[PDB]
């Protein structure tokens, strides 16, 4: 008759009354984001989100979460990408990400758009998700760098990509992590994340406090001595090494 909370290493969690087999199955299960406040509440089967409605975790009483549903009929479902499909709702934003980041012109010269904080946050804060289609390292490594601007290694078997035209916010805004530019003195890192809609992906997490309207940057981590990297990154590495 109790409630259970199961946390992922990234700080998100599933919460609810488990069934006889210890599974997160029911009509009142929730995924709670790492702010411990934004939640997707509703029907889950063995921890997979079937219909999660946007909610706010208002309090816990005896361990039991007390949610308030947000207005608007915002509903989400598990929707892991494939090699060819990035999302079934490319234009439906992630509600936690939408409160934390926006896209605008980068402050880095000739670097296109960048990702910026909406609000002040502390260290270790998950800001944005890096979802994309899932393809192999062989495909990515055997094609030209001009097609590999948005490729992010997930693990030894899978690379996440945001190919054209999903690199434009008008065609894809379900996640925004591909909009963060590179720096050798970054304020964020790529980190593993298990997302209830996107499945196992990576996120952008701050390494230190960031101010409102500060540009979020991450180290892209190309191999400097296999560098195997785009020319703009090669140029910047030589500059970084000279400051050191």
């Amino acid at each position: 008759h109790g409630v259970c909370w199961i946390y992922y290493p990234d700080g998100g969690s599933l919460v609810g009354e488990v069934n006889e087999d210890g599974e997160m199955t029911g009509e009142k299960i929730a995924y709670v984001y790492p702010d411990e406040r934004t939640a997707l509440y509703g029907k889950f089967i063995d921890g997979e989100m079937i219909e999660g409605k946007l909610a706010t975790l208002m309090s816990t009483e005896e361990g039991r979460p007390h949610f308030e549903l947000m207005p608007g009929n915002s509903v989400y479902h598990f929707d892991k990408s494939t090699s060819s499909c990035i999302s079934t709702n490319a234009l439906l934003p992630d509600p936690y990400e939408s409160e934390r980041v926006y896209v605008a012109e980068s402050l880095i010269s000739s670097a296109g758009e960048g990702l910026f904080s909406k609000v002040a946050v502390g260290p270790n804060t998950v800001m944005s998700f890096y979802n994309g289609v899932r393809i192999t390292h062989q495909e990515v490594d055997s094609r030209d760098w001009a097609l590999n601007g948005n490729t992010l290694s997930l693990d030894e078997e899978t690379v996440i990509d945001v190919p054209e035209p999903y690199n434009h916010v008008s065609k894809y805004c379900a996640s925004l992590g591909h909009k963060a530019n590179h720096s050798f003195t970054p304020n964020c890192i790529y980190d593993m994340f298990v997302h209830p809609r996107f499945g196992p992906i990576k996120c952008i997490r701050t390494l230190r406090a960031v101010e409102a309207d500060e540009e979020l940057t991450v180290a892209y981590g190309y191999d400097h001595s296999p560098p195997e990297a785009p020319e703009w990154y090669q140029v910047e590495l030589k500059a970084f090494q000279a400051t050191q």
Binding site: V140, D141, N148, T151, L152, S153, Y190, Y220, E228
Partner: peptide, 8 residues
Amino acid sequence: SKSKDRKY
């Protein structure tokens, strides 16, 4: 590899 963040 021609992707970000691989563990070398």
